[PDB]
Structure 1
Amino acid sequence: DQICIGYHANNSTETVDTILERNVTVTHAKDILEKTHNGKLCKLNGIPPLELGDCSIAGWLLGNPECDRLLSVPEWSYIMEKENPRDGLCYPGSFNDYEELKHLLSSVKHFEKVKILPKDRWTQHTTTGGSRACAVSGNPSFFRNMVWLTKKGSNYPVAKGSYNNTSGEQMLIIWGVHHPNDETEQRTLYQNVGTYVSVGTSTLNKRSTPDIATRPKVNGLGSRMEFSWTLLDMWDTINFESTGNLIAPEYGFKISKRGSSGIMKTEGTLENCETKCQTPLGAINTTLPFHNVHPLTIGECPKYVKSEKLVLATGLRNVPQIAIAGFIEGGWQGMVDGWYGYHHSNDQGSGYAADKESTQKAFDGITNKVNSVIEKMNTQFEAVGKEFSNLERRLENLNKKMEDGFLDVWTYNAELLVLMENERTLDFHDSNVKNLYDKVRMQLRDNVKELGNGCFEFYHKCDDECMNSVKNGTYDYPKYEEESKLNRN
């Protein structure tokens, strides 16, 4: 007596945004933005990071007496460093090309300390010099990785040292120069005035001269110490020559592991976890293509956008409004086996149903849409943090401009794409329902009476079999032609 065509409604309350309307309630929705972390600094690929504590990279490499817990350091995934470390250079001074050194350390996962110039080889000089700035238990001391050379008796002969890199990998060597505060200091320490420090390799040639002047007091001293570094290649020799003011190295750091890493600025401590993407606030465990947790990330991470919600409409519109009418008035609550379906009402009882073909096709289409949006984003290993000195403000501003531009582009594209796709899927569902209605109408032809709310009354008597035939798409119009014709007039 009746067969109606409609769609499915539920008790959901998820709202989605569209380029034409705002706050539209849908049956189902998928979130493609991640907003949750665990709030803990954790391991990366199972390898604990290098927790420097209150030390700095220079303090670790030079061997500050307050950083004695890092004399031997195992393999690491990344480096954790405070924004303002307290234990850096105990003796005041500088460190040439510090940022380049940090960037180099952002690509090595393990070192190996090798003794290259033993302290006992300097038989003609004093090697037991220290200062009150780097004091240990009230006694003056010095760095644990470098040697301070001083006159023995009243003579300072020319000091020579060499090292042939037979270790098996690239080696990093750090030396220093000393700038005293007065000519009295220079005479007391080296016995001669007008000295030089010469360092030379196969591709490096550097000569330095000490500067003697009165400077403001830092850590109680008016003197400074300038440190420089180099990368010694395999089977390559490095030569040291100096008449005074040479802070010679005793160890060299050879690169052993090599990989991808970075420096992260936090103020926390490592805990027991395991993650793939790490942020200064916490770790991220997701498969979504976007997130808004933090811009500075280390690892394989989703894209960062400046949005608050990015929801893709998967299901139909929720119009809870409902003999029983069809899809013109609204959705159906009693149909739970699919998306688009039927309701039949004859002399053998009423009931709902579902159309498997149309629902399956729509489901496949929506799944493919979501997959196309999600799996077309390329994810790699990147470290966003970068360090620039106070004389490189233009470079820092260029970096900041690039990051801001990329962020703006991705935010705009993501938001507009979500809005347009939501509009298209909301039109897709209505098109599907109307196509089903039109197919049923063209199959039924004049044998029925289109009421106008969404369904038809038959002009004949139809049992269950004819209802299934209409639902299955195998109506036999000529069989009921004569019977249905009589009742029309």
Structure 2
Amino acid sequence: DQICIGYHANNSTEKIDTILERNVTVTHAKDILEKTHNGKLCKLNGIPPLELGDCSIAGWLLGNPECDRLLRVPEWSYIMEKENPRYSLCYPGSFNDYEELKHLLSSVKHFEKVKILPKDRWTQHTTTGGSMACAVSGKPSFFRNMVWLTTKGPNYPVAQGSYNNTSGEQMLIIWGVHHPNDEAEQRALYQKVGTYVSASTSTLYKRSIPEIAARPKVNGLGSRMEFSWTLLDMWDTINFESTGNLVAPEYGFKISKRGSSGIMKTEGTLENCETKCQTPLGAINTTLPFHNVHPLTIGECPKYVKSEKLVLATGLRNVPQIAGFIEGGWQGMVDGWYGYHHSNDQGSGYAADKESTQKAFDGITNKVNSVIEKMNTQFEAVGKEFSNLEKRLENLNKKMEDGFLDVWTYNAELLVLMENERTLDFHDSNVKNLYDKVRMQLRDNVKELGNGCFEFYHKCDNECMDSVKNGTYDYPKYEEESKLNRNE
């Protein structure tokens, strides 16, 4: 009769990494990194994005004639824009604090267009100006949200306007100033020189003067238009005054819905899907903690690390080979992790130990949960745009994002390596503990063989083996008989 102690081996070829060894085959493993996407830009939480197309943010807000599908847009979740949009300010010029406007848009989910200053109130001026830069079907045209005020007859009276914010929320207002090419066109348009444009609120004052100078021709014109914007608060008033060179607003953008949004720079097209996380390359449909697809991401998403493989060992080391546990593992054990093999006059067979296997199972489950359920609250790494005169700020942003990402990559990798090593040591210690427990309970009644086996000095029936398996072995009951067999 004999009883021997061993562990479980199977046909798995999964491999994990430790701090002392590389490419170690294990019975079970868990991958906590996601490396695949569907390659599609699709809807997030039911609300589709805002597909700008060839438009730009300024082109959409100002009302570019070639951008007219966005004159009334519903609620969105994120704004899809191209790297170098082709429909933009058609009239050459600039747009002050453009990146601040984009940052503000990164937290707005719906706009409502309110006619604050109608086009028919300017009864002392001409409001039908246009340029061949923003041409519609050949004939000249202009932006569809702005009014170009021009002299009516040989007179340009002082243009005055005002609006009180009785809409319910904060409003966004954009106006412009025209810089001509020569004095002749300034006289032919506004009839007066030394003009000014004044915009005023309770917290804002601004006065601008046109500047006339020959400039390199962009889009065929040497003139420019400079645009500015403001955020009018509730129950506040905005005042416009101008003696010339004013591009007045006709509409204002009320912030209806607010939340966490963003601007995604892609060249793709929206496709009918649904997801909870979105990256420029594609969407992510997972429950795993980590991913390595793309740093930029909108929505609740797994964290990002620059790694190729992050695999946690949850099973024993696969060393296929009766002897026991020192020689190698067993392929016949299909019930648990650690167990016994018994051979007596009534037969032979394998069996598993419930207590130790369960203790190790909960231990490994707790370890996996602790790694996953604490490695959350990582960084965000969301988009942000900077101008050509803010290079130091852009470098600071890049360095900060890169440093945090590197730190988290290091943390995850070292954690996984150390826990894999400790798990393997844990399993070895558990097998040794079972062997030592059985040896201590059996004492001198048996003989060790050196392979993890025990050979009895008496007869162990099936109930005797059940007793030794469940730790109720009666040493005196078989002592005296053994005292014969050993001595003979």
Give the TM-score taking structure 2 as reference length: 0.99
Q: Does 186-195 or 410-419 show the bigger shift?
A: 410-419
Q: 1:44 to 1:294 in 2, by over 3 A?
A: same
What 5-or-longer segments of structure 2 have no aligned partner?
Answer: none
- Spell out, residue by residue over 1:66-103, the C-alpha distance to the aligned partner (whole angstroms, 9 max, x if none): 11000000000010000000000000000000000000
**How far apart, CA to CA, are the structure 1 residues paired with 2:94 and 2:393?**
21
**How far apart, CA to CA, are the structure 1 residues paired with 2:221 and 2:360?**
77
Q: Is the 8 A contact 1:301 1:380 kept in 2?
A: no
- Using the TM superposition, give the Cα deviation of residue 379 of structure 1 relative to its aligned residue in structure 2, in angstroms: 4.3
- Spell out, residue by residue over 1:96-145, the C-alpha distance to the aligned partner (whole angstroms, 9 max, x if none): 00000000011010000000101000111000010000000111000000
Q: Secondary structure at the match of 1:74?
A: coil
1:219 alignment partner in structure 2? 219
- Using the TM superposition, give the Cα deviation of residue 383 of structure 1 relative to its aligned residue in structure 2, in angstroms: 6.0
Q: Secondary structure at the match of 1:255?
A: strand
Q: Is the 8 A contact 1:182 1:212 kept in 2?
A: yes
- Spell out, residue by residue over 1:406-464, the C-alpha distance to the aligned partner (whole angstroms, 9 max, x if none): 11111111111111111100000000000000000000000000001011000001110
**How far apart, CA to CA, are the structure 2 residues paired with 1:29 and 1:182?**
75
What 5-or-longer segments of structure 1 have no aligned partner?
Answer: none
**How far apart, CA to CA, are the structure 2 residues paired with 1:41 and 1:299?**
13
2:118 alignment partner in structure 1? 118
- Spell out, residue by residue over 1:29-69, the C-alpha distance to the aligned partner (whole angstroms, 9 max, x if none): 00111101111111111110111000000000000001100
Q: Is the 8 A contact 1:265 1:280 kept in 2?
A: yes
- Spell out, residue by residue over 1:334-356, the C-alpha distance to the aligned partner (whole angstroms, 9 max, x if none): 01000000000011111100000
- Spell out, residue by residue over 1:176-218, the C-alpha distance to the aligned partner (whole angstroms, 9 max, x if none): 0000000001000000111000000001000000000000000
Q: Secondary structure at the match of 1:469?
A: helix
Q: Secondary structure at the match of 2:240?
A: strand
**How far apart, CA to CA, are the structure 2 residues paired with 1:125 and 1:381?**
55
Q: Does 255-264 or 378-387 show the bigger shift?
A: 378-387
Percent same amino acid among aligned pairs? 95
**How far apart, CA to CA, are the structure 2 residues paired with 1:383 and 1:17?**
29
- Using the TM superposition, give the Cα deviation of residue 378 of structure 1 relative to its aligned residue in structure 2, in angstroms: 3.0
Q: Is the 8 A contact 1:180 1:213 kept in 2?
A: yes
Q: Secondary structure at the match of 1:67?
A: helix
Give the TM-score taking structure 1 as reference length: 0.99
- Using the TM superposition, give the Cα deviation of residue 382 of structure 1 relative to its aligned residue in structure 2, in angstroms: 4.5
Q: Is the 8 A contact 1:299 1:383 kept in 2?
A: no
- Using the TM superposition, give the Cα deviation of residue 299 of structure 1 relative to its aligned residue in structure 2, in angstroms: 1.4
Q: Is the 8 A contact 2:379 2:404 kept in 1?
A: no
Give the counterpart of 1:396 among 394, 397, 404.
Answer: 394
**How far apart, CA to CA, are the structure 2 residues paired with 1:263 and 1:380?**
21
1:7 alignment partner in structure 2? 7
**How far apart, CA to CA, are the structure 2 residues paired with 1:85 and 1:285?**
30
* Aligned-pair Cα RMSD in Å: 1.0
- Using the TM superposition, give the Cα deviation of residue 306 of structure 1 relative to its aligned residue in structure 2, in angstroms: 1.2
- Spell out, residue by residue over 1:201-239, the C-alpha distance to the aligned partner (whole angstroms, 9 max, x if none): 001000000000000000000000000000111111110
Q: Is the 8 A contact 1:30 1:314 kept in 2?
A: yes
1:100 alignment partner in structure 2? 100
Q: Is the 8 A contact 1:302 1:379 kept in 2?
A: no
**How far apart, CA to CA, are the structure 2 residues paired with 1:132 and 1:395?**
38
Q: Is the 8 A contact 2:337 2:352 kept in 1?
A: yes
- Using the TM superposition, give the Cα deviation of residue 26 of structure 1 relative to its aligned residue in structure 2, in angstroms: 0.2
Q: Is the 8 A contact 1:33 1:289 kept in 2?
A: yes
- Using the TM superposition, give the Cα deviation of residue 380 of structure 1 relative to its aligned residue in structure 2, in angstroms: 8.2
**How far apart, CA to CA, are the structure 2 residues paired with 1:408 and 1:68?**
44
Q: Secondary structure at the match of 2:352?
A: coil
**How far apart, CA to CA, are the structure 1 residues paired with 2:379 and 2:108?**
14
**How far apart, CA to CA, are the structure 2 residues paired with 1:391 and 1:17?**
47
Q: Is the 8 A contact 2:303 2:376 kept in 1?
A: no
